[PDB]
Design a protein around this ligand. Structure first.
Ligand SMILES: Nc1ccn([C@@H]2O[C@H](COP(=O)(O)OP(=O)(O)OP(=O)(O)O)[C@@H](O)[C@H]2O)c(=O)n1
Ligand SMILES: [Mg+2]
Length: 230
């Protein structure tokens, strides 16, 4: 009976992407970056609603560029990603969400997300007491490079290491309280799983895809444009 809610943190600036316009609004193959994320969730009718969190100062979001897609947008963006997620989780109650419902937090900067991968995550963790994330095992040899230079100090082990992606699937009640705990202890975490972990819970990993990579630096735009439109 647990309903499915989607939460798209979209209140970032994309400072590493070198784009003056927020990278989530950057046009790829004649289409906005965010549009690919929303279209993927829109294809999944089993979702109750998709909430997009944008900054209160966002003057670039144009709803007309996303017409036909089923989603809602709220200007409850925070100073950080975790804050934007926290405000979003609170905001979900407006749409009838409860603490027992699932929430799937997905980066807008990951346009390669597909309905198949969404439903793979859901189907694998729907009966899980905690939930989990989509992720990718570290395939490359890890090198330690001291900050400030390009010199390699030594080789680090990659055994048992995964690179976390999104969506990150957890219960609204457990996730909100976890982040609330993290903020109460002065911790700003990188993803939702981290809060779940520090709260004392054990999240799961589901095999992700390199197609689901996040656009982060100027190379990624043309690369995603190659990955997309295919
Ligand atoms: N204060 C913030 C910061 C990030 N995000 C969202 O979190 C997702 C992934 O975070 P990231 O890749 O780091 O995007 P940015 O923070 O905007 O870029 P940068 O880290 O280079 O500044 C993005 O969809 C971004 O919009 C958000 O909603 N509110
Ligand atoms: Mg960031």
């Amino acid at each position: 009976t647990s309903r499915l809610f989607a939460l798209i943190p979209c209140a970032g600036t994309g400072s590493r992407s070198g784009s003056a316009l927020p990278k989530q609004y950057r046009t790829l193959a004649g289409r906005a970056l965010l549009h690919y994320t929303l279209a993927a969730f829109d294809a999944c009718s089993e979702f109750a609603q998709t909430l997009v969190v944008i900054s209160p100062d966002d003057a670039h979001f144009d709803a007309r560029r996303f017409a036909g897609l089923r989603f809602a947008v709220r200007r409850c963006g925070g100073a950080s990603r975790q804050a934007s997620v926290m405000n979003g989780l609170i905001q979900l109650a407006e749409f009838g969400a409860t603490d027992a419902d699932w929430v799937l937090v997905h980066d807008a900067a990951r346009p390669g997300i597909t309905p198949a991968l969404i439903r793979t995550l859901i189907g694998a963790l729907k009966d899980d007491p905690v939930g989990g994330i989509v992720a990718l095992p570290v395939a490359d040899t890890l090198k330690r490079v001291p900050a400030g230079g390009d010199a390699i100090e030594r080789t680090e082990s990659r055994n048992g290491l995964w690179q976390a992606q999104t969506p990150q699937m957890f219960r609204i009640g457990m996730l909100r309280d976890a982040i609330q705990r993290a903020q109460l202890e002065g911790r700003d975490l990188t993803d939702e799983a981290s809060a779940i972990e520090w709260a004392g819970h054990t999240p799961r990993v589901v095999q992700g895809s390199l197609r689901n990579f996040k656009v982060t630096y100027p190379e990624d735009f043309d690369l995603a444009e190659a990955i997309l439109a295919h």
